[model samples]
Target: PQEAGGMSELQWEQAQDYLKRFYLYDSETKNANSLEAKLKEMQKFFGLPITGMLNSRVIEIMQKPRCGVPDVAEYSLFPNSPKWTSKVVTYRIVSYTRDLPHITVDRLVSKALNMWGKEIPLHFRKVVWGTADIMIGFARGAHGDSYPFDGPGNTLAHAFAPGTGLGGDAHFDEDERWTDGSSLGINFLYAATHALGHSLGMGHSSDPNAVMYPTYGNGDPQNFKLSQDDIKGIQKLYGKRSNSRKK
Candidate 1:
């Protein structure tokens, strides 16, 4: 039951893991100044004011349900840039949520991929069997991955950036009340779009309208469209969808 600055020991443990997962914090690092410095870097990544104060405001947002991927890589330099080298990508829903029918899950997953599909030259094909570049699934509490689900709100879902094995995989918390419309709870479409964006090697955008923005406040999935910030950021990575015809 250890608590410091309004966070429990387990919460602090996750915070360290979150920091180092992106290489912002070191294992042997010590002292308040260095710790405060790390906090500033974290604030910058999450689009928060660069105040290393580490107060209630910062602590509050840290608990907010958002993309589970560390934001440091988004703000800091990544030695291995996390984008797919291949133009064609394959994905498979290795598992699903009991909350929604399997068939409906299929449509939602595909539709989520389409949000980015229309934005980039890369193609996302659904594979029925064998390995896939991206694998979508549902799980809860201390899953195989290091960043496991917390059985509800703190992390709605998470995705790995493009690479191999666990990379590009998106996992949803089965504990969440997933809804196609988000009328009652967290919207699957919104969460899926955000998770798949990570699978595409995109990260949180400061822009509130961007799909890659870290926080989720359910939106009108029916009229959903990627914000310009999203379009520009992704285009900077993979470029516009190509065609055989010349302009």
Candidate 2:
């Protein structure tokens, strides 16, 4: 079914747009050489055929839900793989989404940070005033960051890789109806947990089952867990918490 024939004009155009937006396609000179290389790279990442064309398979993968953060060759870490020098990291909630209770937001945010802290040697602490290693908030549209929120749906939120200042800051679009343990709208806990993954210096995983897979999926917050790939990735950076490493 894939690569049966040449892509239509619209499909071709949309394909190029998707590739560029996802960081697969680069440079303004969109030639056959560049396009083919980019297409192959995307195929490799998504485990699709390296046909280097606008195939149905590639198109399907492109249309699937993914993170707002741009995909990069550095699958792990930011520039130079920024990491915290200290064992303990502090965070401050600059604001919360009105969609959920203040208490709920606070609890869930802490829980999400704990998700990673449990696996690595890192510790996360909440701060009431002053600065923190990570600052989280909810805002709509251009909220002062280079990557602006796209309102509801599509890109739900984004977090910066570990660094100074805005580094590790997580932001959610206030437009979405944030919920907890409910199917009505986006789950704040799930989204926050995913965002914290980025905050902790890990990148999106190719495994769909991974919590850091980029695409938001309804997950059990009460019994939340990270995939082996997620555990292995973060441990590679921070090491395990004492004897917490799984045998």
Candidate 3:
């Protein structure tokens, strides 16, 4: 089975499935028969033309590299978006990416986590032993979670919302060459900042320019700042930092 546009029926179905799975399109209620409406919502979120049809442009964006987390809802926290009750959250680098030096990985992880720390009353600390609140790492293939990593190009990484145990953990697909350069491989800091957004109970932003947007993008790292939408979302959960330094 196939659509008129050369996309297989299965592919179209999968695209719709992703919409429902990510909560971009609601299947159980609202517009159960309206794929056009669902497609419009997805297009709007991705900054597309809102054509309300699975056109070539829609399929192309669907095929781009994106975070592993489902865009379950528009600019809202995870199911209930469980946030950390503590002011100081501890994290541990459970593993590393072979593409960059250990210190580079360390610095990037710290810098990335700090992105969130700067926004809320929360603080982050790196730990070596014992159970930490957020566990960070890189792995290949089915690395011990319900959601497995798909090779290099498609799904870059994902993180769990804050909770006990596996919650707040972020995993990068070691299959991709994690790097700092915008031209080569996925940018570590950019991806990490996005992943950390999830770890902080933030969800995909409707604003494509937001760091929490499902699709990844590299910005001027030296002057990186959270988008106003991103700032508003997180502050809703943890409130703004009172004594934080300017970035």
lDDT winner among the candidates? 3
lDDT of 2 at 140: 65
Tens-digit per-residue lDDT, 98-188, candidate 2: 6677788878888777777777777667687688878778876576766555566455666677766666687776776678766466666
Q: Per-residue lDDT tens digits of candidate 1, residues 1-247?
A: 3134565678755665545544434465556457778777667766666477554445555656665555544434432557776758788787777778888887888777877777677766767668887778887756676655557656677667776665667777778778774456767777778888888777778765767666445444664666788777877766565321221
Give all candidate RMSDs, comma-separated. 5.9, 4.4, 5.0
lDDT of 3 at 9: 81
Q: Mark the regions of model 3 whose C-alpha exceeds 4 Å error after superposition.
A: 1-34, 47-51, 73-81, 181-183, 215-223, 242-247
Compute the lDDT for candidate 1.
0.67
Ranked by TM-score, the better of candidates 1 and 2 is 2
Superposed Cα deviation of residue 247, candidate 1 (Å): 23
Quick one: RMSD of model 1? 5.9
- CA lDDT, candidate 1, residue 75: 38
For model 2, name the residue pairs that clash. none
For model 2 the local lDDT of residue 162 reads 71
Candidate 3 residue-wise lDDT, 20-89, digit = tens: 6455234463455777666777777776554767745566556667677766634444444366666588
